[PDB]
Amino acid sequence: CNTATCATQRLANFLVHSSNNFGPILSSTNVGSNTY
Amino acid sequence: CNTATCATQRLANFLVHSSNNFGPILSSTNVGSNTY
Amino acid sequence: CNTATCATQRLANFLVHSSNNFGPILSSTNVGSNTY
Amino acid sequence: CNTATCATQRLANFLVHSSNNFGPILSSTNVGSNTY
Amino acid sequence: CNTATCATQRLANFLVHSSNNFGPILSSTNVGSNTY
Amino acid sequence: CNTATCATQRLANFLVHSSNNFGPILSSTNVGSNTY
Amino acid sequence: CNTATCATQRLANFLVHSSNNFGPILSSTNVGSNTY
Amino acid sequence: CNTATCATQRLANFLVHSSNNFGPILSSTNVGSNTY
Amino acid sequence: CNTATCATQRLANFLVHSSNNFGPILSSTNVGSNTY
Amino acid sequence: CNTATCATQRLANFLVHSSNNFGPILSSTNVGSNTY
Amino acid sequence: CNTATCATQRLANFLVHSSNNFGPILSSTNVGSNTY
Amino acid sequence: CNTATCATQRLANFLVHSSNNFGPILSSTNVGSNTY
Amino acid sequence: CNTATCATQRLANFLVHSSNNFGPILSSTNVGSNTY
Amino acid sequence: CNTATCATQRLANFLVHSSNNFGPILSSTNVGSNTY
Amino acid sequence: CNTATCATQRLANFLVHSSNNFGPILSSTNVGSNTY
C-alpha cells in the first residue's frame, strides 16, 4: 500500500462458535460442567 | 506502507467462544464447575 | 512504515471466552467452584 | 517506523475470560471457592 | 523508531480474568474463601 | 445413596413463565400495571 | 447419604417469572406502577 | 449424612421475579411508583 | 451430621425481586416515589 | 453436629429487593422521596 | 376531560427503527462508521 | 382537565433508533468512528 | 388544569439513540474515535 | 394550574445518547480519543 | 400557579451523553486523551 489506506485482515486456523439461550432450562447435569 | 495508513490485523491459532443466558435456570450440577 | 501511521495487531495462540447471565439462578454445586 | 507513528501490539500466549451476572443467585457451594 | 513516536506493547504469558456481580447473593460457603 | 453421589431434584406444585421482547412497543395502557 | 456426597434440592409451592425488554418503549401508564 | 458431605437446600413458599430493561424508556406515570 | 460437613439452607416465606435498568429514562412521576 | 463442621443458615420472614440504574435519568418527582 | 383520567399520546412526524444482532459478525468496513 | 388527572404526552419531530449486539465482533474499521 | 393534577410532557426536536454491546470485540480503528 | 399540582416538563432541541460495554475489548486506536 | 405546587423543568439546547465500561480493556492510544 503506497500512499494508500488499507484494512487487510489475514485470519487462519481458528474456531468461532456461538450459543444463545432465552427460555428457562430445567435440566440436571451431574457429570460435566455447564457454563451459561 | 510507504506514506500510508494501514490497519492490518494478522491473527492465527485461536478460539473465540461465546454463550448467552437470559432466562432463569433450575439445575443442580454436583460434579463440575459452573461459571455464569 | 516509512513516513506513515500504522496500527498493526499481531495476535497468536490465545483463547477468548465470554459468558453472560441475566436471570436468577437456582442451583446447588457441591463439588467445584462457581465464579459469577 | 522511520519518521512515522506506529501503534503495534504484539500479543501471544494468553487467556482472556469474562463472566457477567445480573440476577440474584440462590446456591450453596460447600466444596470450592466462589468469587463474585 | 528513528525520528518517530511509537507506542508498542509487547505482552506475553499472562492471564486476564474478570467477574461482575450486581444482584444480591444468598449462599453459604463453608470450605473455601470468597472475595467479592 | 450409600457411598454414592446423587443430584436429585424433587420439584412439585409450581409455575414457570417467561416472556421476551426485542422490538420497540407503541402502546398506552391506562388501567393496569406493565412491568418490562 | 452414608459416606456419600448428595446435592438434593427439595422445592415446593413457588412461582418463578421472568421478563426481558431490549427495545425502546413508548407508553404512558397513568393508573398503575411500572418497574423496569 | 453420616461421614458425608451434603448440600441440601429445602426451599418453600416463595416468589422469585426478575425484570430487565436495556433500551431508553419514554413514559409518564402519574399515579403509582416506578423503581428501575 | 455425624463426623460430617453439611451446608443446609432451610429458607421459607420470603420474596426475592430484582430490577435492572441500563438505558436513559425520560419520565415524570408526580405522585409516588421512585428509587433507582 | 457431633465432631462435625456445619454451616446451616435458617432464614425466615424477610424481604430482599434490589434495584440497579446505569443511565442518566431525567425526571421531576415533586411529591415523594427519591433515594438513589 | 372533565372529572376524568385520560392518557392521550399525540405523536406525529417521527421515525422508529430497530436492529438486533445475536451471532458473531466477520466483516471489514473501511469507508463508513459502524455502531453496534 | 378540570378536577381531573391527565397524563398527556405531545411528542413531535424526533428520531428514536436502537441497536443491540450480543456476539463477539471481528472487524477492522479504519476510516470512521465506532461506538459500542 | 383547574383543581387537578397533570403530568404533561411536551417534547420536540430531539434525537434518542442507544447502543448495547455484550460480547468481546476484536477491532483496530486507526482513524476515528471509539467511545464504549 | 389554579389550586392544582402540575409536573410539566417542556424539553426541546437536545440529544440523548447512550452506550454500554460489558465484554473485554481488544483494540488499538492511534488517531482519536477513546473515553470508556 | 395560584395557590398551587408546580414542579416545571424548562430545559433547552443541551447534550446528555453517557458511557459504561465493565470489562478489562487492552488498548494503546498514543495520540489523544482517554478519560475513564
Q: For residue C32, give the DSSP letter.
A: S
For residue O20, how many C-alpha atoms fall within 13 Å in the half-sphere facing its CB? Answer: 22
Sequence letter at residue B1: C
CA distance I30 to L14: 25
Q: For residue G31, give the DSSP letter.
A: B
Residue J21, number of CB atoms within 10 A of its CB? 18
Identify the chains in contact with K, defined as 3+ C-beta pairs within 8 A.
A, B, F, G, L, M
Task: State the nearest Cα–Cα gap between H7 and chain G, in angstroms.
Answer: 5
Q: Three-state DSSP class for M16?
A: strand
Pairwise CB contact (< 8 Å): E32 & D28: no
Q: Is O20 exposed, middle or buried (0-12, 13-18, 19+ CB in 10 A)?
A: middle
Hey, which bits of A1-36 come out as E strands? 11-21
Sequence letter at residue H1: C
Q: Which residue has the cell 429514562?
A: I25
Beta partners for I4? none
Pairwise CB contact (< 8 Å): A22 & G18: no
Task: State the nearest Cα–Cα gap between J31 and chain N, in angstroms.
Answer: 9
Please name the residues between 1 and 36 in chain N that touch chain C, using a CB distance below 8 Å.
22-24, 26, 28-31
Q: For residue C31, give the DSSP letter.
A: B
Pairwise CB contact (< 8 Å): N12 & M12: yes
User: Could you give the C-alpha distances from J15 to D24, I17, J18, K24, M30, in angstroms and in order?
Assistant: 13, 9, 10, 40, 51
| Residue I19 neighbours by CB under 8 Å, 6+ apart | G35, G36, H18, H19, H21, H35, H36, J18, J19, J20
Pairwise CB contact (< 8 Å): N4 & M9: no
Identify the chains in contact with J, defined as 3+ C-beta pairs within 8 A.
D, E, H, I, N, O
> Nearest residue of C to residue L24 by CA position?
C18
Residue H2, number of CB atoms within 10 A of its CB? 11
Q: Three-state DSSP class for D30?
A: coil
Q: Which of J21, J29, J34 sits opposite I21 (nearest CB)?
A: J21
> Nearest residue of I to residue J21 by CA position?
I21
Identify the chains in contact with B, defined as 3+ C-beta pairs within 8 A.
A, C, D, F, G, H, K, L, M
* Chain N partners within 8 Å of H30 (Cβ): 7
The C-alpha angle I20, L36, B10, rounded to 5 degrees, equals 135
Pairwise CB contact (< 8 Å): B34 & A35: yes
CA distance N16 to L14: 11
The 3-class secondary structure across chain L, one letter per residue, is: CCCCCCCCCCEEEEEEEEEEECCCEECCCCECCCCC
User: Could you give the C-alpha distances from G13 to C1, D3, F12, H27, in angstroms and in order?
Assistant: 69, 73, 7, 35
Method of determination used here: cryo-EM
**Cβ(K16)–Cβ(L14) under 8 Å?**
no
Pairwise CB contact (< 8 Å): O24 & E16: yes
Burial G3-29 (b: 16+ CB within 10 A, else e): ebbbbbbebeebebbbbbbbbbbbbbb
Identify the chains in contact with N, defined as 3+ C-beta pairs within 8 A.
C, D, E, H, I, J, L, M, O
Task: State the nearest Cα–Cα gap between G17 and chain B, in angstroms.
Answer: 8
Task: State the nearest Cα–Cα gap between N17 and chain H, in angstroms.
Answer: 10
The dihedral formed by the CA atoms of F16, F22, F27 and F29, expressed in degrees to the nearest 10: 30
> Nearest residue of K to residue A18 by CA position?
K23
Q: For residue B24, give the DSSP letter.
A: P
CA distance E29 to E27: 6
The distance from CA J22 to its chain's CA centroid, rounded to whole angstroms, is: 17
> Nearest residue of N to residue J30 by CA position?
N7
**Cβ(D11)–Cβ(N24) under 8 Å?**
no
* Chain D partners within 8 Å of H11 (Cβ): 26
Pairwise CB contact (< 8 Å): O7 & I30: yes
